[PDB]
């Protein structure tokens, strides 16, 4: 049969809040990191542990941002989070000016 759209979503939320491993693929993140750092300094090296620490901080930051954004959407009474939600979120956090 067909699962009514949105019924697997909650299941996935339940899984991914149960799970705790990192959710971005390790090498692609690492390469994005090396790229960004190259812009600041050439011939840089990273400890693997340092890259994993960056990924941890980045993911946990993003998770908290998504949480806040979701709350904004709910305040919009929207199930669907939107860029305007992220903007409002960060704005209230005072990240973006």
């Amino acid at each position: 049969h067909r699962y009514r759209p949105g019924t697997v979503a909650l299941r996935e939320i339940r899984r991914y809040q149960k799970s705790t491993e990192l959710l971005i693929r390790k090498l692609p993140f690492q390469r994005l990191v090396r790229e960004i750092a190259q812009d600041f300094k050439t011939d840089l090296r990273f400890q693997s542990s340092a890259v994993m620490a960056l990924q941890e901080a980045s993911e946990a930051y993003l998770v908290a941002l998504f949480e806040d954004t979701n709350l904004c959407a709910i305040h919009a009474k929207r199930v669907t989070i939107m860029p305007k939600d992220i903007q409002l979120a960060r704005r209230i956090r005072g990240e973006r000016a």
Binding site: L10, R14, K18, A53, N70, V79
Partner: protein, 103 residues
């Protein structure tokens, strides 16, 4: 030994050393490191207790970062102390908002 003299597990000596080397003040009175070590052992006890209880809840022989994150975020006071802290491999608490669940 001095932690003996105080009943502490945490190293009163090394806490005194770190307070001296950390340039926190010109002088560090001998009572200060004892007190701080005791506080650093009441803390840590608090959380390791909660993490071991969570490990029992999660039926585990070892505390893993999941259990620390669970303990920290379930205890409202530790979550106040550590609200600006993130923990490796901790994940997050179960959080689904009422309008997302079906009626």
């Amino acid at each position: 030994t001095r932690s003996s003299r105080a009943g502490l597990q945490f190293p009163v000596g090394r806490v005194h050393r770190l307070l001296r080397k950390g340039n926190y003040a010109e002088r560090v009175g001998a009572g200060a490191p004892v007190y701080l070590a005791a506080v650093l052992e009441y803390l840590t006890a608090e959380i390791l207790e909660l993490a071991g209880n969570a490990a029992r809840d999660n039926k585990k022989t070892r505390i893993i970062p999941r259990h620390l994150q669970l303990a920290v975020r379930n205890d409202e006071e530790l979550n106040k102390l550590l609200g600006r802290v993130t923990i490796a491999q901790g994940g997050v608490l179960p959080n689904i908002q009422s309008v997302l669940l079906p009626k």
